[PDB]
Amino acid sequence: GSQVDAEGNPFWEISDKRRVGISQFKKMDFINIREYYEAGGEMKPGKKGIGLTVDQYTAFLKAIPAINAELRSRGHDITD
Amino acid sequence: GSQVDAEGNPFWEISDKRRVGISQFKKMDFINIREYYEAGGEMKPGKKGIGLTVDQYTAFLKAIPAINAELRSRGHDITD
Numbered sequence A, B: 001g002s003q004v005d006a007e008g009n010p011f012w013e014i015s016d017k018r019r020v021g022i023s024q025f026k027k028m029d030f031i032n033i034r035e036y037y038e039a040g041g042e043m044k045p046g047k048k049g050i051g052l053t054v055d056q057y058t059a060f061l062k063a064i065p066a067i068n069a070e071l072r073s074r075g076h077d078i079t080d
Helices: A054-073 B054-073
Strands: A010-013 A018-025 A028-039 A042-053 B010-013 B018-025 B028-039 B042-053
Touching (some): A010 B054, A018 B054, A042 B028, A054 B010, A054 B018, B042 B054
Antiparallel strands (some): A018 A028, A028 A042, B010 B018, B028 B042
């Protein structure tokens, strides 16, 4: 499910500490994939991550079938 | 299209400097999304990026329809 982070941006958890979220800067949207760390009980964005532009994200989407096929070859069950 | 990088791992370009590739360490596979920099004509992996486990990557896949819907709301054309 989608949540709203401390900055008021939507995000999805992909593990206990890693998020994918969407931020907006100067009217441009970014897809942020990033690991958060916990300090004093607060989750804070850390250095492991990347903010994709929409065009980079859509290029990633186009590569996903090939990425998935490679992972299936390596023995991983991946959905269509 | 899929290429093979200097380390002998498959990768896909998502922009001029950013790649998604798959590496293997101790028999575990990682999906690496990372920006490369150019020095002396050589492309080198930089600090902007993240190496997802397969489970993190599949969780990301499950979130993509919702991420896409949010981006469409924001005005971006995104394919199914």
